[PDB]
């Protein structure tokens, strides 16, 4: 298995963490990861997608072919990327118009996107071509938590393209939590929005807090010992949005926040100093003390 | 054209009357042995495979016999010296293209007895050569008779 | 009270342009098959909490109310997708609103942190770019000090610097090149 | 300038029924196509595909009952053994296996008849024209 | 004889006319050659223009027609009468369709829909030319029918055949007959019992001189044509002699078995040994085996002695002259819309759940309960449209019969209960027949059941008390509702029936993109089928309401009655014949033909191929697949569709 | 005709045609029923040719006397919106082709006596009543479309561009007066807006109608299709409260008219309609239910979608068969679901539109039902 890794901005320039976790993750369960020398932002598609759908396109498409001129394909660890590069992707594939008004624009630059990349994001992957049972297998540190798994809403939707099954009652990361030893439990709204998806967290603060207070308070009530997201986004407005909801409505919880790639990390025997949760805006300590 | 075919035909003209070829297909000719069921042929071989059975009718053993789409008149001594038919009189007179008349029969009765289920794919892969296994004498007289380039 | 002279009788087909050809046209035109069931605003987390109701917007670009492009309201849309997957008429509802955004800011509607992260983008090629103090935290858990990225590729930044005035998306923004930041 | 030629032959149960359906919703499509009527696609054979060729066809298009619906109950299983040797008799003889369609489109399928004719003739089209004829004159 | 050929091009009003330039097609038509006469009317199937056919066949001696206008499908059988009036053979005459498949698909091409439409008329002139005058073949009639299906549909058109005095056959699938029907308590807008209406129905079709009521038992095989059809209905194994058995009851008392009753949708419970329901008819009992025991208790308690374990199916040859399909549908199945709940929340039912419920005779005993707790919900919410003008589940139809039952059930309801709380979730209330309106006004007014419209967004419970809250949109207050409930009716739509697969295989018919059966034409013919003898009747046709099933039943029985009354029908003469003189015998013929119908012969002293003229359906692929071409189908002659090719680039000559 | 959009011609023409050459029916065109005796099975009926004033045998339905009668009458199968002549054809595909004089607006001066070949004109012909005995007896009388002139905040008969739906498929008809031109009756020009009012008549307590006509959401729809078929740059508004598209391809035509024509709907029933004097163009006053607002938007024609009534004569046939009428006024069938075509009287049935509002496949089907019961 090898696949062009997409990083994005706030994995690799803030939660590095997340990439060393997925790093060591990734090589343990028997998948190569390249590096995509020359990736941009994929661009975030909450700006860019809203401000101008031709430039969100012609940028996701110089990035996918970085990954074709390589021969491979491509995983992210981010539903903001997944999203963007994955829709991009199916469009330029189904619309004749897109791919040709993008290819005037890459023509350029001396690029030419051709249809032969795949985009895919490390826990459908995992899923569906690698197996559940080969995380439980690599399992060193079984984790003794309830965790309150948050899907995040570009993972599986739209379900027309991605084809990853309900985005209703999904099942597919509460077996991979489930692997570790770990507990998903079951909370009210459970694939409600965190608020940060299009540019709200940017444009709305207020508003975006009020649905992650929202999805906190209902992983709390369901006996939640933190919560774990496949999506930098989720993560900084579960993270840095606890330190926001402090300030500005005066609620604290201190509820862990990790990263899928980082809950199986500390599983599959790592040391919590290379997940970097001394960067967490929300001290994951507490949780340590329950693993 | 046999000999004697020629000559009713020369010495129709000669008494001021009308010649006549024979209209019906080869099979009446031939002396193998058809099956009152019907035709259906489980596989397709070039003429060098197997053993052919000189009793049986060699289209239904599996091998393409043209005899079918072919007018009769020649006695059929092809399949009667062990061969079977290659089309060289022609078709019938309500026949334009043989090969393609040929083609519709071999792909209708191939796989008839497991007609839903037989894969259609089987046929085309057998033969690798088409024009020349179906168009040997007729390619000029063909609704196609040439090779695009 | 709501006159003829006060609606835009092309607003759709000006949302359907717009949408042509990304997302598409057969996504955008979807709008006409809406029969306003409130499906959209029911399944909407950001209604829940705001005065912000999504078939309203879909009304709004049938009824010829542009005023919808001056909205702040398309902006309180998360982009969730749950209207989307619910619509019972196959409307592309989150591409809609998204299309919208896009005339919204063509009219000027864009919020600075928005242009800021536009901007951060074009200039240094990613939207949350590295630091002094991302440097030190890759180096310490076993990461290349810089990662693969545009950001440290002179080549890929201007592929892109190409691309965004090939797009005229710097003009969009109001992003000067000379000055290195967001005109006025 | 240029404009395919397109041919069809649609058994009437099924695929004439879908044309016919597609007309009464006012479903639009190119223009190319001259649909032919038979009362099954077991009445199509290379014969009728080869000559419409001959003739100046850009394109051939087929279209019968979906298999098992048949409304003379097997007709459709012999055109479909008939069209896959046809397809590449045609490659043999230069003639693109492209240019030849063949689909299972029922009586009240519409929607897919004017999508089917959408696709083929955008695929002629890209093709450009049919120099058989030409040849032949020549 | 050389051809002489009129050639008549139709406006249909603009629906030709607006797109294609007739008058120019119809200057076109004059080009070509044995055309004599070429001329266009706005309504060529109109009497002006039949006669104008009528008089240039007589004036100018016309040996062929051509009509440019609609598809054959639709009309060909009355050009063919009007030209058969003039005494031109009625197989002298060809369809050139350039309304369907030109006007209607091209108008925003009007240049090369002209140019089409030529080619068209140039297409169908060349097949002409080559036509031959055939003759109708003449078919005598079994004075017999037989209805599929014995719900409200199928037992009305029982009922009326057998009244006018022909035989009728009426098979059911189930035990008894009555339907969905009989599963309702009662029905809109009379708010009658089903029973009332039904009950005497089922009674007097079970006891008809003319009708031979086969319950229990399902069509297994149907050959033939309008007129002649031999079939094969499968009688399956009660293990209960049917003469003997009185309807006690007194086995299924001491049955030790229980098994989810299907009638009551999987809320009420029976024993192996059973009776659908109480009124049902035939009034008989059923054993099934899939969850008896043979533990014997039934046999000890039975007095004639009516059970029979040993008892095997018996298979029923009929011949019939026509057939009624009337199998009515299903209920949805709401589990695909998931954030309803269905199948995940127990308070969570369905609109047929419900019927069963508040029956008298029901599960329940006529009482409305919750199935988290066993107790009466004070609080309801009915959910309209729920697999029906939904493009997610892939039913964008309206299923008709919703609006009116979740207005009449919740009348019921509150009849039962008065200080019931109803709300109705809707996007339009569809109240659209005689007496209709009235019952929607008498349900807000007279019994207070209010209305929300909105298409609820997702349905969701409380885990600590099993309750229901409802996320929607009042579209009319512009505001987000979260009410609370105690159930929550789902009004799913109608859908076909399981086993409709099956019996449309076995007659040969289609289905519209609604996936129910289709008829020839909604208005030219509404419960016939393009299969010739075949007749539609009820639900099976569409979501339908009980007035619009029993008049489809009333209606098919008429259409049905007409070749039975005739003694006669004319079939198409389009049959495959070998010409002996060409046919070599090779047998390649035999073994395409799914009725046997060419058979290889002796004829003068050598094997030659014969088809049976009766056998042959006329679908071409015998003589498609002739490698002599002795073989051919009269009317679509190998060399009729070369000339019709030709015609496509060029005129003949 | 929707849902199809067939002429209605292309399914009319043709049984009109069958059904006045049948072996088995003896068509009685231009007469009435006057009286009935007897009951079931044993009917003794008396129908009244009307005269027409010509000789059917010679008469061949050329025309030309039509083209020089002097007198000129309105045309009632165009509703008013055309003019007649009083030697006239009530449409060219009439059957029986032949001419009728209305001797009301007859002054018999003979012009077409003299360009008719056959000799056809007959001023003498008198009515006669034919005495047939029968077993059964099937009413099909159909319907009359509500009279909006009462509901006066539309302006119905004040206004000249408020037309009814009946006037509008006669304007958009082919064959029609205007040659299938919709135009304003103020100015003779196209409207370029157009407002679609439903339930005119029906769902109203103001004016006795509390039933649904069935068919006015579906014909509002499907002439608005034409209209954009005809004129793409139309805008059309159709104010309901709910569209009832409820049978087969009911509810897809209705998905069809806004996606694939551009048609808008508002929900909302107006208040009321006001013309521009110095334009004749009229204002739909009338609350957009879902966006809680008032909307003024103006218009160059209202069509009015008027409901079904009972027709004028079904009083008269009312006491001919001895029947009765539900609280509709349409006839009353013997019950609902038990016999939906038959009527309490023995012998007596209904088929069509006269025994509720309803579709032609309804129709059809009733015709069909109504034969088998009688
Ligand atoms: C919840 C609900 C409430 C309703 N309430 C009303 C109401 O109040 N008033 C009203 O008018 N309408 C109502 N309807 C609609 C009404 O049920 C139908 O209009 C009516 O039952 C149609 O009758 P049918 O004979 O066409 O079909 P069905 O009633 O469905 O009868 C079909 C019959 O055919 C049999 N069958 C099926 N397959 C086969 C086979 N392969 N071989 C032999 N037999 C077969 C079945 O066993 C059954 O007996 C309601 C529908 C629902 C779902
Ligand atoms: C504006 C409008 C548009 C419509 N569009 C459509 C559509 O697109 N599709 C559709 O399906 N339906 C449509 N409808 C409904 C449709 O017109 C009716 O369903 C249909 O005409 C009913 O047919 P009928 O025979 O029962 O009644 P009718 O068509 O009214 O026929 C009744 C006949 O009986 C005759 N008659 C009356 N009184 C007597 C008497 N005393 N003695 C003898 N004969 C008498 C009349 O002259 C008439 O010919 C529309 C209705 C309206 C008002
Ligand atoms: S062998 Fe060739 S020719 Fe002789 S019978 Fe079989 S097919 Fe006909
Ligand atoms: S090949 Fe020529 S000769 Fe030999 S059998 Fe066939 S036709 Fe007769
Ligand atoms: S859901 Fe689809 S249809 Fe219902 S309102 Fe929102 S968009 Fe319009
Ligand atoms: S997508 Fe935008 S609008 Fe549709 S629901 Fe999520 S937030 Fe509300
Ligand atoms: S035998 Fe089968 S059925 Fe008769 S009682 Fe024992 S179990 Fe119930
Ligand atoms: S079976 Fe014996 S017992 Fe059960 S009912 Fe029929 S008769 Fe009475
Ligand atoms: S009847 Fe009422 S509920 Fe049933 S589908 Fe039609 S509209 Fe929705
Ligand atoms: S296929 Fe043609 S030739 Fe062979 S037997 Fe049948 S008819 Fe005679
Ligand atoms: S034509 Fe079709 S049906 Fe008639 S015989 Fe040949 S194969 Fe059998
Ligand atoms: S039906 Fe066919 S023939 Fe009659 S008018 Fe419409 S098109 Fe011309
Ligand atoms: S006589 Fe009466 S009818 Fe003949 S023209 Fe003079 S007016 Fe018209
Ligand atoms: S003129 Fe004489 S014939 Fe010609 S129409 Fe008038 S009446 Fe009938
Ligand atoms: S059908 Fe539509 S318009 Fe006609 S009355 Fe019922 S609702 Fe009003
Ligand atoms: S009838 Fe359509 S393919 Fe046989
Ligand atoms: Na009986």
């Given at each position: 298995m090898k696949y062009a890794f997409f990083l994005g901005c706030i994995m690799p320039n803030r939660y590095a963490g997340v990439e060393a976790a997925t790093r060591t993750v990734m090589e343990k369960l028997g998948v190569e990861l390249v590096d995509m020398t020359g990736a941009s932002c994929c661009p975030a598609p909450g700006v860019f997608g809203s401000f101008d759908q031709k430039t969100w396109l012609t940028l996701a498409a110089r990035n996918l072919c970085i990954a074709e001129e390589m021969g491979v394909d491509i995983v992210t660890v981010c539903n903001g990327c997944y999203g963007s590069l994955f829709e991009a992707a199916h469009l330029l594939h189904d619309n004749k118009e897109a791919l040709n008004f993008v290819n005037e624009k890459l023509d350029k630059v001396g690029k030419e996107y051709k249809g032969n990349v795949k985009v895919r994001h490390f826990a459908e992957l995992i899923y569906n071509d690698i197996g559940v049972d080969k995380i439980a297998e690599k399992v060193e540190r079984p984790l003794n938590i309830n965790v309150?798994?948050?899907?995040?809403?570009?993972?599986?939707?739209?379900?027309?393209?991605?084809?990853?099954?309900?985005?209703?009652?999904?099942?597919?990361?509460?077996?991979?939590?489930?692997?570790?030893?770990?507990?998903?439990?079951?909370?009210?709204?459970?694939?409600?929005?965190?608020?940060?998806?299009?540019?709200?967290?940017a444009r709305e603060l207020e508003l975006s807090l009020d649905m992650t207070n929202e999805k906190i308070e209902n992983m709390i009530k369901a006996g939640a010992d933190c919560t774990v997201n496949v999506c930098p986004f989720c993560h900084l407005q579960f993270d840095r949005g606890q330190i926001e909801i402090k300030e500005k409505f005066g609620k604290e919880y201190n509820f862990p926040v990790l990263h899928l790639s980082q809950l199986l990390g500390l599983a599959m025997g790592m040391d919590p100093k290379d997940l970097a949760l001394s960067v967490h805006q929300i001290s994951v300590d507490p949780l340590l003390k329950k693993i | 054209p046999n000999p004697e075919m020629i000559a009713e035909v020369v010495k129709a003209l000669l008494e001021g009357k009308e010649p006549e070829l024979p209209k019906k297909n080869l099979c009446e000719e031939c002396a193998r042995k058809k099956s009152e069921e019907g035709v259906a042929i489980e596989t397709?071989?070039?003429?060098?495979?197997?053993?052919?059975?000189?009793?049986?009718?060699?289209?239904?053993?599996?091998?393409?016999?043209?005899?079918?789409?072919?007018?009769?008149?020649?006695?059929?001594?092809?399949?009667?010296?062990?061969?079977?038919?290659?089309?060289?009189?022609?078709?019938?007179?309500?026949?334009?293209?043989?090969?393609?008349?040929?083609?519709?029969?071999?792909?209708s009765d191939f796989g008839i007895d497991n007609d839903r289920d037989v894969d259609p794919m089987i046929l085309p892969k057998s033969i690798k050569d088409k024009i020349g296994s179906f168009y040997k004498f007729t390619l000029p007289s063909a609704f196609v008779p040439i090779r695009l380039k | 009270?709501?006159?003829?002279?006060?609606?835009?009788?092309?607003?759709?087909?000006?949302?359907?342009?717009?949408?042509?050809?990304?997302?598409?046209?057969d996504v955008v035109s979807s709008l006409k098959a809406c029969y306003q069931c409130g499906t959209c605003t029911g399944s909407c987390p950001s209604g829940r909490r705001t005065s912000y109701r999504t078939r309203k917007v879909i009304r709004k670009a049938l009824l010829g109310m542009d005023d919808v492009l001056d909205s702040d309201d398309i902006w309180k849309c998360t982009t969730c997708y749950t209207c989307y997957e619910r619509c019972p008429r196959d409307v592309k509802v989150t591409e809609i609103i998204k299309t919208i955004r896009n005339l919204a800011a063509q009219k000027g509607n864009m919020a600075k942190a928005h242009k800021m992260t536009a901007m951060y983008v074009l200039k240094y090629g990613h939207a949350v770019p590295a630091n002094k103090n991302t440097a030190e935290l890759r180096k310490s858990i076993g990461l290349s000090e810089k990662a693969p990225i545009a950001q440290f590729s002179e080549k890929d930044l201007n592929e892109m610097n190409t691309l965004i005035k090939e797009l005229g998306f710097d003009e969009l923004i109001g992003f000067d090149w000379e000055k290195g930041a967001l005109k006025e | 300038?240029?404009?395919?030629?397109?041919?069809?032959?649609?058994?009437?149960?099924?695929?004439?029924?879908?044309?016919?359906?597609?007309?009464?919703?006012?479903?639009?499509?190119?223009?190319?196509?001259?649909?032919?009527?038979?009362?099954?696609?077991?009445?199509?054979?290379?014969?009728?595909?080869?000559?419409?060729?001959?003739?100046?066809?850009?394109?051939?298009?087929?279209?019968?009952?979906?298999?098992?619906?048949?409304?003379?109950?097997?007709?459709?299983?012999?055109?479909?053994?008939?069209?896959?040797?046809?397809?590449?008799?045609?490659?043999?003889?230069?003639?693109e296996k492209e240019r030849l369609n063949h689909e299972w489109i029922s009586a009240s399928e519409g929607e897919k008849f004017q999508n089917t004719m959408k696709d083929f003739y955008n695929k002629i089209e890209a093709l450009g024209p049919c120099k058989l004829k030409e040849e032949l004159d020549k | 004889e050389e051809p002489r050929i009129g050639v008549y091009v139709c406006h249909c009003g603009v629906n030709i006319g607006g797109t294609v330039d007739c008058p120019d097609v119809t200057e076109f038509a004059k080009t070509l050659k044995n055309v004599v006469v070429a001329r266009d009317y706005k309504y060529m199937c109109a009497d002006p223009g039949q006669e104008m056919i009528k008089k240039d066949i007589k004036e100018h001696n016309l040996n062929r027609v051509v009509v440019a206008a609609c598809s054959p499908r639709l009309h060909e059988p009355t050009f063919r009468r009007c030209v058969a009036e003039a005494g031109l053979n009625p197989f002298l005459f060809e369809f050139a369709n350039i309304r369907e498949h030109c006007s209607w698909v091209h108008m925003h091409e009007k240049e090369k829909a002209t140019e089409k439409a030529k080619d068209l008329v140039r297409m169908a002139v060349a097949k002409a030319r080559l036509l031959e005058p055939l003759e109708f073949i003449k078919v005598g009639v079994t004075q017999r029918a037989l209805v599929i299906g014995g719900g409200v549909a199928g037992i009305q058109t029982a009922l009326d055949?057998?009244?006018?005095?022909?035989?009728?056959?009426?098979?059911?699938?189930?035990?008894s007959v009555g339907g969905r029907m009989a599963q309702l308590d009662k029905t809109f807008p009379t708010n009658d019992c089903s029973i009332c209406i039904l009950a005497p129905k089922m009674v007097d079709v079970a006891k008809h001189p003319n009708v031979k009521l086969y319950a229990y038992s399902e069509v297994v095989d149907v050959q033939g044509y309008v007129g002649n059809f031999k079939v094969k209905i499968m009688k399956k194994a009660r293990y209960i002699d049917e003469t003997k058995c009185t309807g006690c009851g007194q086995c299924s008392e001491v049955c030790p078995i229980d098994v989810p009753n299907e009638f009551d949708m999987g809320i009420g419970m029976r024993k192996a040994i059973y009776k659908p329901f109480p009124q049902a008819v035939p009034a008989k009992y059923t054993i099934d085996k899939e969850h008896c025991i043979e533990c014997g208790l039934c046999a000890k308690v039975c007095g004639p002695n009516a059970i029979d374990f040993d008892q095997e199916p018996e298979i029923i040859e009929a011949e019939v002259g026509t057939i009624i399909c009337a199998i009515g549908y299903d209920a949805f199945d709401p589990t695909v819309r998931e954030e309803y709940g269905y199948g995940v929340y127990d308070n969570v039912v369905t609109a047929l759940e419900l019927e069963r419920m508040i029956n008298a005779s029901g599960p329940t005993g006529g009482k409305v309960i919750?199935?988290?707790?066993?107790?009466?919900?004070?609080?309801?919410?009915?959910?309209?449209?729920?697999?029906?003008?939904?493009?997610?589940?892939?039913?964008?139809?309206?299923?008709?019969?919703?609006?009116?039952?979740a207005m009449k059930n919740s009348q019921l309801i509150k009849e039962k209960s008065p200080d019931t709380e109803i709300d109705i979730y809707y996007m339009d209330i569809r109240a659209f027949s005689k007496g209709y309106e009235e019952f929607y006004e008498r349900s807000a007014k007279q019994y207070g059941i209010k209305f929300m419209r909105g298409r609820p967004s997702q349905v969701i419970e409380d885990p600590e008390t099993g309750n229901l809250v409802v996320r929607a949109?009042?579209?009319?207050?512009?505001?987000?509702?979260?009410?609370?409930?105690?159930?929550?009716?789902?009004?799913?739509?109608?859908?076909?029936?399981?086993?409709?697969?099956?019996?449309?295989?076995?007659?040969?018919?289609?289905?519209?993109?609604?996936?129910?059966?289709?008829?020839?034409?909604?208005?030219?013919?509404?419960?016939?089928?393009?299969?010739d003898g075949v007749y539609l009747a009820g639900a099976c046709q569409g979501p339908k309401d009980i007035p619009a099933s029993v008049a489809q039943?009333?209606?098919?029985?008429?259409?049905?009655?007409?070749?039975?009354?005739?003694?006669?029908?004319?079939?198409?003469?389009?049959?495959?014949?070998?010409?002996?003189?060409?046919?070599?015998?090779?047998?390649?013929?035999?073994?395409?033909?799914?009725?046997?119908?060419?058979?290889?012969?002796?004829?003068?002293?050598?094997?030659?191929?014969?088809?049976?003229?009766?056998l042959c359906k006329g679908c071409g692929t015998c003589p498609a697949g002739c490698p002599s071409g002795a073989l051919e189908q009269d009317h679509f002659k190998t060399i009729q569709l070369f000339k019709q090719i030709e015609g496509m680039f060029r005129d003949t000559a």
């Open positions: 309150g798994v948050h899907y995040g809403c570009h993972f599986l939707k739209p379900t027309d393209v991605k084809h990853l099954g309900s985005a209703e009652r999904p099942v597919m990361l509460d077996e991979i939590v489930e692997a570790t030893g770990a507990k998903s439990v079951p909370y009210a709204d459970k694939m409600m929005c965190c608020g940060a998806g299009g540019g709200v967290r | 397709i071989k070039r003429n060098y495979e197997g053993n052919p059975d000189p009793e049986k009718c060699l289209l239904e053993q599996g091998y393409i016999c043209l005899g079918i789409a072919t007018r009769e008149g020649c006695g059929a001594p092809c399949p009667s010296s062990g061969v079977p038919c290659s089309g060289c009189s022609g078709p019938t007179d309500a026949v334009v293209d043989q090969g393609a008349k040929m083609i519709s029969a071999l792909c | 009270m709501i006159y003829s002279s006060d609606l835009n009788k092309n607003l759709a087909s000006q949302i359907i342009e717009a949408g042509t050809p990304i997302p598409g046209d | 300038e240029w404009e395919p030629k397109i041919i069809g032959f649609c058994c009437n149960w099924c695929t004439y029924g879908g044309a016919d359906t597609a007309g009464v919703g006012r479903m639009q499509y190119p223009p190319s196509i001259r649909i032919i009527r038979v009362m099954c696609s077991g009445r199509i054979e290379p014969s009728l595909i080869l000559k419409a060729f001959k003739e100046g066809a850009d394109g051939v298009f087929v279209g019968g009952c979906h298999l098992g619906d048949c409304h003379y109950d097997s007709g459709n299983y012999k055109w479909q053994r008939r069209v896959m040797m046809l397809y590449e008799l045609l490659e043999e003889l230069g003639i | 055949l057998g009244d006018m005095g022909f035989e009728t056959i009426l098979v059911e699938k189930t035990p919750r199935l988290s707790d066993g107790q009466k919900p004070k609080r309801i919410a009915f959910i309209q449209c729920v697999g029906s003008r939904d493009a997610k589940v892939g039913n964008k139809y309206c299923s008709n019969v919703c609006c009116m039952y949109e009042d579209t009319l207050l512009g505001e987000i509702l979260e009410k609370e409930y105690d159930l929550v009716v789902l009004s799913v739509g109608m859908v076909p029936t399981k086993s409709a697969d099956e019996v449309q295989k076995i007659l040969g018919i289609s289905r519209t993109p609604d996936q129910f059966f289709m008829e020839a034409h909604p208005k030219l013919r509404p419960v016939d089928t393009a299969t039943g009333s209606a098919a029985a008429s259409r049905a009655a007409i070749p039975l009354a005739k003694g006669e029908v004319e079939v198409e003469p389009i049959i495959a014949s070998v010409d002996a003189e060409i046919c070599g015998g090779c047998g390649v013929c035999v073994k395409q033909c799914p009725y046997g119908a060419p058979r290889l012969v002796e004829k003068d002293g050598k094997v030659v191929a014969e088809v049976i003229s009766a």
